[model samples]
Target: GHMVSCCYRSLAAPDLTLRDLLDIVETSQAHNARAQLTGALFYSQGVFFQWLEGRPAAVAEVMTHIQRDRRHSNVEILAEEPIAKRRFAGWHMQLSCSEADMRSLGLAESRQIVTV
Candidate 1:
């Protein structure tokens, strides 16, 4: 299996409410679920940070869709590597906002934060 983590800034909306923030995710059309991706999808301030774990080919295809997604821009791969197992496989498509909401999920590491 493989893991692909990426970050990007949105091209639409100045800021997002929980409702608005979450739309940034579902608009992907559950490509994550269908891709067999299990990981987190985060939105705060005006940026997005997501990580997906699944078959190497699966993750790569998802990244393609995400990069072509018109909702956001500057999609960048932050990390990618092979892993013997999935770290956040317990659940999938965790959409949340704020640093305070990060814990209590399966967070095992840190990444750059988004701020207004």
Candidate 2:
């Protein structure tokens, strides 16, 4: 099987809130489980970065849905590639919605403390 991975950045809609983030995560975890996809997701400063790994067609289908999602905008792909194995093999969708989680991922060193 092929591993399709990508990272993208987006801005949350004006009406979005932290509670909405939890809802999104719940929905995503369910969806990812159904799709048999595995990956990591990070949200910070109204931005999001995600990586997905799965079969080529499966990954592409999920990416299409993400591109059309209404909760965020300016969906720009930072990277996309195929790999032999999964980097997030154990998680259906691991989430990083806090400053600590972001720091552990080596992202956003300068951003102030945030909880979401």
In order, candidate lDDTs are 0.60, 0.76
- Residue pairs with backbone overlap in model 1: none
The residue-by-residue lDDT of candidate 2 on 22-81, one tens digit each, is 887887888888777888777766677787777778889888998998889999988889
In the range 1-116, model 1's lDDT, one tens digit per residue, is: 33543333344334334565467556554666676777777565456677777777877777777778666676667677777777776334544344544443334565988997
lDDT for model 1 comes to: 0.60
Candidate number of the best lDDT: 2
Model 1: lowest-lDDT 10 consecutive positions: 7-16
